[PDB]
Amino acid sequence: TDRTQEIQKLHELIKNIDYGMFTTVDDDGSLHSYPMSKSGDINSEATLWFFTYAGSHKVTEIEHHEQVNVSFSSPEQQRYVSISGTSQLVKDRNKMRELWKPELQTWFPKGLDEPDIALLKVNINQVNYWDSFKPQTISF
Amino acid sequence: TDRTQEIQKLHELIKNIDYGMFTTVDDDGSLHSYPMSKSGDEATLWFFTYAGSHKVTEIEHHEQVNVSFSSPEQQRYVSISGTSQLVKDRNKMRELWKPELQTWFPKGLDEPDIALLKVNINQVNYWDSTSSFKPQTISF
Numbered sequence: 324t325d326r327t328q329e330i331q332k333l334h335e336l337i338k339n340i341d342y343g344m345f346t347t348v349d350d351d352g353s354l355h356s357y358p359m360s361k362s363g364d365i366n367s368e369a370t371l372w373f374f375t376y377a378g379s380h381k382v383t384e385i386e387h388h389e390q391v392n393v394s395f396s397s398p399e400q401q402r403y404v405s406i407s408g409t410s411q412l413v414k415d416r417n418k419m420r421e422l423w424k425p426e427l428q429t430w431f432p433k434g435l436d437e438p439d440i441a442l443l444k445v446n447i448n449q450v451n452y453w454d455s456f457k458p459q460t461i462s463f
Numbered sequence: 464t465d466r467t468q469e470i471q472k473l474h475e476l477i478k479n480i481d482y483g484m485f486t487t488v489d490d491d492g493s494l495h496s497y498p499m500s501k502s503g504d505e506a507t508l509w510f511f512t513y514a515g516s517h518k519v520t521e522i523e524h525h526e527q528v529n530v531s532f533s534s535p536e537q538q539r540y541v542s543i544s545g546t547s548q549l550v551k552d553r554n555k556m557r558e559l560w561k562p563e564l565q566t567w568f569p570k571g572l573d574e575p576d577i578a579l580l581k582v583n584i585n586q587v588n589y590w591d592s593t594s595s596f597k598p599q600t601i602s603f
């Protein structure tokens with residue numbers, strides 16, 4: 324598929340940008356953004372994965388408004404990426420085991436035995452990027 | 464007071480970051496982000512735009528926006544929640560114009576469709592080396 328090519332393009336775009344800004348909309352219609360660093364590379368599935376505490380303030384926003392945006396800004400590379408998609412909180416044990424890295428101990432002291440540890444998944448719908456003015460678009 | 468101070472911290476935070484990612488919500492609930500060059504130095508941000516742009520149509524139905532500023536090199540990530548409005552004031556444009564903007568506005572202030580977006584800031588959330596990267600908040 325050109326799906327493979329699109330997922331590959333997205334990988335090349337964001338692989339070197341460790342933190343993106345994850346934006347939600349809340350009940351009042353306000354938009355809040357949060358620095359987030361994904362776990363794992365994109366592959367096959369056009370899905371991004373992030374560890375979180377289930378009680379993190381962003382989680383209730385995402386629960387009530389699943390449409391989100393994650394942006395990646397790289398002045399180092401003169402590159403800007405807007406990823407629109409839907410996000411859900413999951414507690415999928417297999418995906419957590421797959422994505423866990425010892426480094427996460429700093430934020431999750433009990434590791435996967437933290438009672439409130441969870442994942443935010445982002446199902447990518449559209450990517451717009453600037454490598455300027457009008458973006459290039461990838462639709463998934 | 465504390466207010467003028469808060470405005471000063473905000474100034475410290477974004478003074479040396481050139482482009483932010485400007486996020487809006489569309490009529491279908493989806494969120495889209497766009498790189499924008501910030502102009503000028505009030506708890507207000509200003510950006511040049513084209514009045515016929517899609518982002519303007521978005522903000523006309525949903526005025527709440529977010530502007531994020533990120534700089535790994537400066538160890539800081541800033542989320543600015545505000546409301547945006549289209550401004551057509553030629554004096555303010557003159558006041559805010561800088562030569563660098565000719566990249567996206569070739570005829571400069573003689574562009575027939577050039578206008579301003581004013582962002583009234585409601586809340587700033589930031590993560591930086593001063594905060595040991597734990598979330599700090601300023602509210603107006």
Ligand SMILES: Cc1cc2nc3c(=O)[nH]c(=O)nc-3n(C[C@H](O)[C@H](O)[C@H](O)COP(=O)(O)O)c2cc1C
Pocket residue numbers: 403453455456457458482497498499500501510511512513515516517518519567
């Ligand atoms: C780094 C950079 C700076 C930009 N600055 C502006 C700007 O200040 N104003 C603007 O309208 N577009 C700017 N753009 C383009 C916007 O990101 C966007 O693609 C464009 O305004 C069209 O958006 P629209 O869907 O609202 O029509 C910039 C693009 C880049 C890559």
Ligand SMILES: [Cl-]
Pocket residue numbers: 333334337338363364365
């Ligand atoms: Cl990736």
